[PDB]
Symmetry: C3
Subunit: 490 residues, 3 copies
Amino acid sequence: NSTATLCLGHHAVPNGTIVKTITNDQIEVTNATELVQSSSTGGICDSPHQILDGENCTLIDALLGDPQCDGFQNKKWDLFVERSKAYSNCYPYDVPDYASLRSLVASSGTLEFNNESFNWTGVTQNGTSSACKRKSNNSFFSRLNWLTHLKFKYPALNVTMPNNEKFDKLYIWGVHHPGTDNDQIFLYAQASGRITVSTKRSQQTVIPNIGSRPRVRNIPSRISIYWTIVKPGDILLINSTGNLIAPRGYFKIRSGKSSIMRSDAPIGKCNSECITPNGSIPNDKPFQNVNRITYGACPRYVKQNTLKLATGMRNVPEKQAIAGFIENGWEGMVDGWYGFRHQNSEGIGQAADLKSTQAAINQINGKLNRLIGKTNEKFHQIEKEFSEVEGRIQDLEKYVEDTKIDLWSYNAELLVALENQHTIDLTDSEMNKLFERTKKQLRENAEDMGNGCFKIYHKCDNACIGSIRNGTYDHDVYRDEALNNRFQIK
Amino acid sequence: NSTATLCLGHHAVPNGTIVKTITNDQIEVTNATELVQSSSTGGICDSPHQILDGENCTLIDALLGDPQCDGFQNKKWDLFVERSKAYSNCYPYDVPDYASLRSLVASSGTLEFNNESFNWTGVTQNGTSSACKRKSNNSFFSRLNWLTHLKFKYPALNVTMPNNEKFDKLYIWGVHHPGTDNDQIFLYAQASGRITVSTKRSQQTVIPNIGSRPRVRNIPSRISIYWTIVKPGDILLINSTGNLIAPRGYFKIRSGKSSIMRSDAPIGKCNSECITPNGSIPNDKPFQNVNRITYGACPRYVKQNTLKLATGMRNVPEKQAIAGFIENGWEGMVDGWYGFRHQNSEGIGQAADLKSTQAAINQINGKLNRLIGKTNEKFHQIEKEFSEVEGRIQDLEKYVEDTKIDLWSYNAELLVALENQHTIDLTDSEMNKLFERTKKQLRENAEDMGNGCFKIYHKCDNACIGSIRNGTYDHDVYRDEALNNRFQIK
Amino acid sequence: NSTATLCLGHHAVPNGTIVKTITNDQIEVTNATELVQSSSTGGICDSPHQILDGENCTLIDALLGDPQCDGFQNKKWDLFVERSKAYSNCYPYDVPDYASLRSLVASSGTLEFNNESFNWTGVTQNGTSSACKRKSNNSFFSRLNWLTHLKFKYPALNVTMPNNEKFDKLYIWGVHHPGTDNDQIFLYAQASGRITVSTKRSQQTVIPNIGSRPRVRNIPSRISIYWTIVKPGDILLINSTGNLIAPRGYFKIRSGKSSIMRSDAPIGKCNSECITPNGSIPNDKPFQNVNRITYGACPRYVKQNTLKLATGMRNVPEKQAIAGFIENGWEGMVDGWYGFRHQNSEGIGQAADLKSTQAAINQINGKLNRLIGKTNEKFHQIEKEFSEVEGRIQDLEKYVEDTKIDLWSYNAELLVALENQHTIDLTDSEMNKLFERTKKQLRENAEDMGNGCFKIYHKCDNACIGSIRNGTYDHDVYRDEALNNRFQIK
Ligand SMILES: *[C@@H]1O[C@H](CO)[C@@H](O[C@@H]2O[C@H](CO)[C@@H](O[C@H]3O[C@H](CO)[C@@H](O)[C@H](O)[C@@H]3O)[C@H](O)[C@H]2NC(C)=O)[C@H](O)[C@H]1NC(C)=O
Ligand SMILES: *[C@@H]1O[C@H](CO)[C@@H](O[C@@H]2O[C@H](CO)[C@@H](O[C@H]3O[C@H](CO)[C@@H](O)[C@H](O)[C@@H]3O)[C@H](O)[C@H]2NC(C)=O)[C@H](O)[C@H]1NC(C)=O
Ligand SMILES: *[C@@H]1O[C@H](CO)[C@@H](O[C@@H]2O[C@H](CO)[C@@H](O[C@H]3O[C@H](CO)[C@@H](O)[C@H](O)[C@@H]3O)[C@H](O)[C@H]2NC(C)=O)[C@H](O)[C@H]1NC(C)=O
Ligand SMILES: *[C@@H]1O[C@H](CO)[C@@H](O[C@@H]2O[C@H](CO)[C@@H](O)[C@H](O)[C@H]2NC(C)=O)[C@H](O)[C@H]1NC(C)=O
Ligand SMILES: *[C@@H]1O[C@H](CO)[C@@H](O[C@@H]2O[C@H](CO)[C@@H](O)[C@H](O)[C@H]2NC(C)=O)[C@H](O)[C@H]1NC(C)=O
Ligand SMILES: *[C@@H]1O[C@H](CO)[C@@H](O[C@@H]2O[C@H](CO)[C@@H](O)[C@H](O)[C@H]2NC(C)=O)[C@H](O)[C@H]1NC(C)=O
Ligand SMILES: CC(=O)N[C@H]1[C@H]([C@H](O)[C@H](O)CO)O[C@@](O)(C(=O)O)C[C@@H]1O
Ligand SMILES: CC(=O)N[C@H]1[C@H]([C@H](O)[C@H](O)CO)O[C@@](O)(C(=O)O)C[C@@H]1O
Ligand SMILES: CC(=O)N[C@H]1[C@H]([C@H](O)[C@H](O)CO)O[C@@](O)(C(=O)O)C[C@@H]1O
Ligand SMILES: *[C@@H]1O[C@H](CO)[C@@H](O)[C@H](O)[C@H]1NC(C)=O
Ligand SMILES: *[C@@H]1O[C@H](CO)[C@@H](O)[C@H](O)[C@H]1NC(C)=O
Ligand SMILES: *[C@@H]1O[C@H](CO)[C@@H](O)[C@H](O)[C@H]1NC(C)=O
Ligand SMILES: *[C@@H]1O[C@H](CO)[C@@H](O)[C@H](O)[C@H]1NC(C)=O
Ligand SMILES: *[C@@H]1O[C@H](CO)[C@@H](O)[C@H](O)[C@H]1NC(C)=O
Ligand SMILES: *[C@@H]1O[C@H](CO)[C@@H](O)[C@H](O)[C@H]1NC(C)=O
Ligand SMILES: *[C@@H]1O[C@H](CO)[C@@H](O)[C@H](O)[C@H]1NC(C)=O
Ligand SMILES: *[C@@H]1O[C@H](CO)[C@@H](O)[C@H](O)[C@H]1NC(C)=O
Ligand SMILES: *[C@@H]1O[C@H](CO)[C@@H](O)[C@H](O)[C@H]1NC(C)=O
Ligand SMILES: *[C@@H]1O[C@H](CO)[C@@H](O)[C@H](O)[C@H]1NC(C)=O
Ligand SMILES: *[C@@H]1O[C@H](CO)[C@@H](O)[C@H](O)[C@H]1NC(C)=O
Ligand SMILES: *[C@@H]1O[C@H](CO)[C@@H](O)[C@H](O)[C@H]1NC(C)=O
Ligand SMILES: *[C@@H]1O[C@H](CO)[C@@H](O)[C@H](O)[C@H]1NC(C)=O
Ligand SMILES: *[C@@H]1O[C@H](CO)[C@@H](O)[C@H](O)[C@H]1NC(C)=O
Ligand SMILES: *[C@@H]1O[C@H](CO)[C@@H](O)[C@H](O)[C@H]1NC(C)=O
Ligand SMILES: *[C@H]1O[C@H](CO)[C@@H](O)[C@H](O)[C@H]1NC(C)=O
Ligand SMILES: *[C@H]1O[C@H](CO)[C@@H](O)[C@H](O)[C@H]1NC(C)=O
Ligand SMILES: *[C@H]1O[C@H](CO)[C@@H](O)[C@H](O)[C@H]1NC(C)=O
């Protein structure tokens, strides 16, 4: 009696969460949020990127014009999606440096094709095959022109096509490798010889090679596919005596943000910025462990499957006389993070301190604002999965990606530890600041009891306590009473 | 009266600057410095690196010996500068893997060439062309030897050149692809056949291919360029029946720090360690946003166009009775960063505290010393801009560089935030330390007024105040007076 | 007299060590530990990885079956070690893209070979050479079959081998380039023609090229080596009229963690997880400066040759009346890190504080636990040293590795500075916490003397001092005595 107690404290919750800081591998805090995205819907959203589902067609099949890919003519995409079920159903072919032609067409993002009138005087055009049926008739790749002899003559071709446009032209062409010498004569009326396709700045010479390969869709022959880009002011020149699978025109070649992805995920009617082979994923979080292959505004790939960011202070159980924050949280404090408990003539009371609570909350919201909803866009990259063994180039592609992921995984680990340490520090600091400013108000009218509470040595009723909480307490009013109570022989 | 006031404080400035810390996206400090270099002079300084301006010549034109490049013979460089205006003016040629030959010669850093006496018995040497004029006469690449028939015979060449030196030899040679069968016979007196250039450890076979290409400087033929490196103790062997553009000797191949850069920046008479395509840039700062392409001791390329490093404390306006540092800076404090203000019998005074001021300044200068003027040198790297579409290899080169820049940009962002937080912390700490040590000196002779000031409960004249500032105040001298004043019923 | 002194302090050592923090380039602490591994034993331990020492054989020589490599047949490895002394001693050969075949076999980790019965009707099998002696007889590569004419006929080969297995088959084969037209006829009875090796998904055509190369072990001819991987359900088809160096079967191709390393280090009977070309190195430390080439659970390569992690507090000399921690350490404090010194009626004493000491030690041990003995495994990577000049691909391989090392070296530098700052902070904090809690116990019975000591204003014998140290001091017992002593006119 003749005194009061005023304790400073902070909240605690019954269901806290464990995070990592620089000081502690495990510390329980009142709340945290997940920074690694680990699930996908399992579908690729068809918005807001332009998606082209290849269905049974690879990009290269759609480029050459396999009959089952006729519906793709002239289409564009942000992301071309190639399915594992895709298969070729025309004349058997290969592309030396297939991966590069696939990449450059994918990045260009368009199959726009402009027909041109090549002068094929002296040969038969439009060769077809039972291996490439279009609406039940023998046919061929839509964008290619199989030239054969005319009246058992195949005169030497020396054919030109100038580029008088303001843009580049991509030409796709081929060399036919017949199964037998019989086929060579039947088709071209003479022995095979080289093909040379040239411009002012480039030349490619290819040798047709007669011979049986293992039959594919019953065909032992092959076509090998080549490409040439022709600049404005340059000229395509084609020089051949046979075996030429000629271009019917050129593809536009564009630059932009298009790419290609291998995925079996279904395409859905929905909207998501970040695409992975597993499906679209939300991009609120800064990191993700779903797939290293991404397109769009995506979280960065890391190895961790969880990284928890503290969003509240240390969670400290309440010890079973009122008491302050020293080794003690207040589970009953539910309208603030920090506050006051008092005992005086009028009872025992609690009040939240708004300023300290808001100071902590604002700083935590600040770091969430830097980390949440801030992903950056990436588009065409490098391949990261491989179906064939290749050696040196693939070794480098894999090492580049491994290197990158380990460096990001490190950054993520350090960032979360540093941020969590800072959160513990800033929330501890708001408690300490509140205690110190209360101490300063009280001057010589109170003593520190060592448990986060002051013994106030004068009668201090509810309004008096309120004056301390509100920062309007006038210590001079009570000093005489308090000094007498403090410094009395007992 | 019978008392004095002593306030602890810190300076403030009218023109502060905004920086970023871990706690605050924006906090005003008294001063900061820029860590991202964003401008260039626009010229490449000719010192201290040895610069070779290619003018109208590419490195490869200078290597082969295009007549307009004769002035480059045998020159060395640290940095070869290739101009966008550069053009070839000799026989039209291509180099399979041009980029690699360009790179290896660039990195070697020398065009030193040693003539050798090949045994070309039975052929005519020194073929020339109107397409390659030297001083108005028909000529040819200086370092190459166009062999043609002698008396309508071209006997099979089987020619040797041993390397009996202690160093490697770089041989440059070529294959002529004539426009027509008429030219083939006119030049070599027989049908074309393969060329084989070999050593004990390597072999290259190349097939001349007759045919018209689009005319370049009125020439429908082409030369294709190849290279062979011959080790000490090995032997070059050249085997041909025509179409051989022979070497006249070898290039020295060196190892060191040389490179090549594409730039149109003028070369100036000045001295700068760091070269970019935009010109030389100062290298005081740790980061730069001028160009990802660099040579020499250069700041690291980042995406940010500014990163401000705090070089002073938080800048806090002065509130409109003297008062201390609590929510309050002192704009009138101009000879120190921290200090004392007092009110006593003799007036109101101010003095700077040297120790605390110097402690902060020394620590800030320390971090400037780690960050300023400490760039590291890089020399030949990878190419980072491309004039042609290529696919896989280029995709990887671009991804490697993008990856690197994003990781450095992250490091830069975190470093500056961490350093700035530390600067705010260390400057706040010097203020708090000064307050605490003053508190300790005063013992029971003063009370904390809560605004960064002490109420000293005894007469404390100028010399008394000085004794506190100087750390020589003897509290026992005044304790009796002070205790009487403090603990008095009023 | 009628008073006592109680000082709070921390230990100091005569032999401290210099570390780097964020605040200080150099600060002496009581102890530190090295985080960069800089030495090796100089031997490669034969455990726990399966080591295969190539001795005089390269992997490719062991693959083809050079007689000196017969002992390697069918062996497996985790790490194949190639020696600089290794040399070929059979028919001279080259491998276009040698580096890739070396890499893919190295990564597969097995030389397991299954013989198959090819139908070589109409030719002579098992050609041998004096250039490839096996037990003093003319012989040839064990895994290859040199086919020559039979009765001066070499009928066109068109030979099949289906893959009816559940795994992939690696075929190694070759093309013989004879020195002269005489050898061509002597061996194959007709002019040279192309070789085509194909599957349903691939084709390779190679042209034998007759001509003398510089003699190697007295042989001017060459064999060029090729490879083909055949999938389950696919078929190998070989088509040739001569010059075929045929496969005798296939290699198993596996996937796993195998690699290859160039080293001259001796192999020892010992156990070490981390292998470098310099020898095995311990992997307790997180970083190493021994070699960028590593295999196994290894520290990460950095440029620094030392990084010292503080494992104790700031080391502060003792100043030459007892005194506390303010600018002063206690070299005589050897059974604790923090403690108490007192002066009372019964003498001058010292005692360690266990709690504070253990708190610091536990946190330091925690960070050691994150950093020590926690390396991660890497296996087959990219090559990092090169014996030949190559240009573009090598430039990229080198730049990737340089980039990686600089980023890790940065991470290491920042990590150690941050950790050391945290250690200084946490150890400083334990001292400050101990002082503050002692202050709180003492209430109004003591004053802070400003040197880390309290003047206790009552008789405080050994048991009284112990009660303070033990946290059981009851300030109310002594308050009357203390207040009288404190507030007395003198
Ligand atoms: C070189 O050898 C090849 C493999 O032995 C061979 O290919 C095979 O040819 C046979 C016979 O033409 C094909 O068998 C087909 O036989 C009947 C004929 O009416 C067809 O109706 C069937 O569809 C049946 O498949 C094989 O399919 C074929 N095998 C492979 C792997 O392609 C070549 O013919 C040989 N080349 C030469 C020039 O002789
Ligand atoms: C294959 O076709 C080529 C393109 O049509 C052709 O090249 C062209 O040849 C003509 C005629 O020689 C050149 O025209 C030149 O005509 C007069 C002749 O006196 C010259 O004075 C002029 O300079 C004029 O240019 C073209 O310049 C040339 N076109 C190109 C694109 O190179 C080849 O000649 C043909 N090849 C064969 C073997 O017939
Ligand atoms: C093309 O030129 C080559 C280099 O001059 C040449 O190779 C050289 O051939 C000679 C003679 O055969 C070899 O000399 C050998 O002479 C005696 C003959 O009994 C041997 O016992 C010795 O071992 C001695 O070496 C050279 O070794 C050889 N030089 C090289 C560098 O390989 C070719 O023969 C020529 N090719 C043609 C088709 O003529
Ligand atoms: C490229 O075109 C030229 C010109 O048409 C071809 O040259 C003719 O080839 C025929 C058939 O081999 C010869 O009989 C003529 O004598 C050639 N004409 C001229 C004007 O030289 C040439 O063969 C073609 N080249 C290729 C590789 O197909
Ligand atoms: C490499 O040089 C050898 C030796 O000079 C050439 O071989 C001669 O070639 C001529 C012309 O074709 C033949 O008539 C001779 O019979 C060959 N001589 C010998 C000793 O074999 C060979 O042709 C050259 N090779 C190449 C690819 O040019
Ligand atoms: C691949 O094998 C086929 C079939 O055996 C070869 O074709 C024969 O080649 C001979 C010799 O040149 C000719 O006389 C026959 O007329 C061909 N037979 C048939 C059925 O066409 C062919 O030459 C081989 N190809 C290669 C590149 O070696
Ligand atoms: C362009 C052309 O001639 N196409 C014809 C081919 C080829 O002559 C041979 O297949 C070449 O080997 O033969 C067919 O029987 C076929 O297989 O469909 C009919 C087709 O019209
Ligand atoms: C080495 C040689 O023979 N050079 C001569 C060439 C070539 O014979 C043809 O250009 C080959 O196509 O012809 C010229 O008229 C020329 O164009 O300058 C004269 C020159 O001396
Ligand atoms: C497969 C074969 O025929 N091997 C024979 C070779 C070759 O005929 C020529 O070396 C080819 O140039 O010649 C030998 O004298 C030799 O050099 O060892 C004997 C050997 O049995
Ligand atoms: C925990 O923190 C997150 C992020 O600020 C917030 O959205 C959520 O409401 C909080 N949860 C609780 C139970 O307070
Ligand atoms: C793709 O091919 C499969 C298998 O032939 C067929 O059943 C399916 O209808 C095809 N899909 C499309 C879209 O053409
Ligand atoms: C096609 O090329 C031939 C060359 O043999 C030429 O003579 C003819 O005029 C060209 N045809 C047309 C329609 O221009
Ligand atoms: C995504 O697909 C990859 C590759 O197939 C797989 O490893 C991973 O488990 C998948 N992740 C999720 C969340 O579906
Ligand atoms: C605000 O201050 C006044 C001072 O008279 C005090 O009585 C009142 O209770 C305070 N309000 C609160 C909500 O604490
Ligand atoms: C601000 O800081 C920089 C770096 O220390 C210093 O060079 C400059 O003089 C300072 N400017 C002012 C106005 O104090
Ligand atoms: C480069 O070529 C241009 C265009 O022909 C010419 O005007 C200029 O003088 C040349 N410069 C040099 C240095 O030869
Ligand atoms: C040049 O080579 C021929 C080979 O046909 C040789 O006979 C002659 O001696 C050589 N000439 C000289 C000058 O050594
Ligand atoms: C430097 O040149 C690059 C590439 O042309 C350009 O993007 C950039 O704006 C330039 N920077 C400056 C400061 O001139
Ligand atoms: C230094 O200390 C003495 C103590 O007598 C004091 O009087 C003097 O004013 C002090 N000097 C300064 C510059 O404060
Ligand atoms: C120093 O620290 C290391 C790592 O904790 C420890 O192993 C060693 O015993 C310590 N050395 C001394 C002299 O205390
Ligand atoms: C390797 O070759 C050298 C040199 O001929 C020989 O002395 C040594 O015994 C060989 N070693 C083995 C293991 O065969
Ligand atoms: C080998 O191939 C020939 C083709 O000429 C074939 O006729 C023969 O039956 C085959 N031999 C065996 C043993 O199967
Ligand atoms: C390891 O070997 C490398 C490469 O030869 C050498 O540079 C380095 O000094 C070696 N390090 C040690 C500790 O032996
Ligand atoms: C523990 O506390 C008791 C309190 O009576 C004290 O007397 C004793 O000396 C303390 N023990 C130590 C080791 O300080
Ligand atoms: C094929 O070419 C012929 C010329 O022989 C042309 O009339 C026809 O329209 C072409 N068919 C196409 C492009 O589908
Ligand atoms: C060209 O070669 C001839 C030999 O026919 C020689 O005499 C002359 O000096 C050479 N000219 C050069 C290298 O400029
Ligand atoms: C070589 O082939 C013959 C068939 O001519 C066979 O009998 C013999 O066993 C073979 N020798 C080997 C595989 O060592």
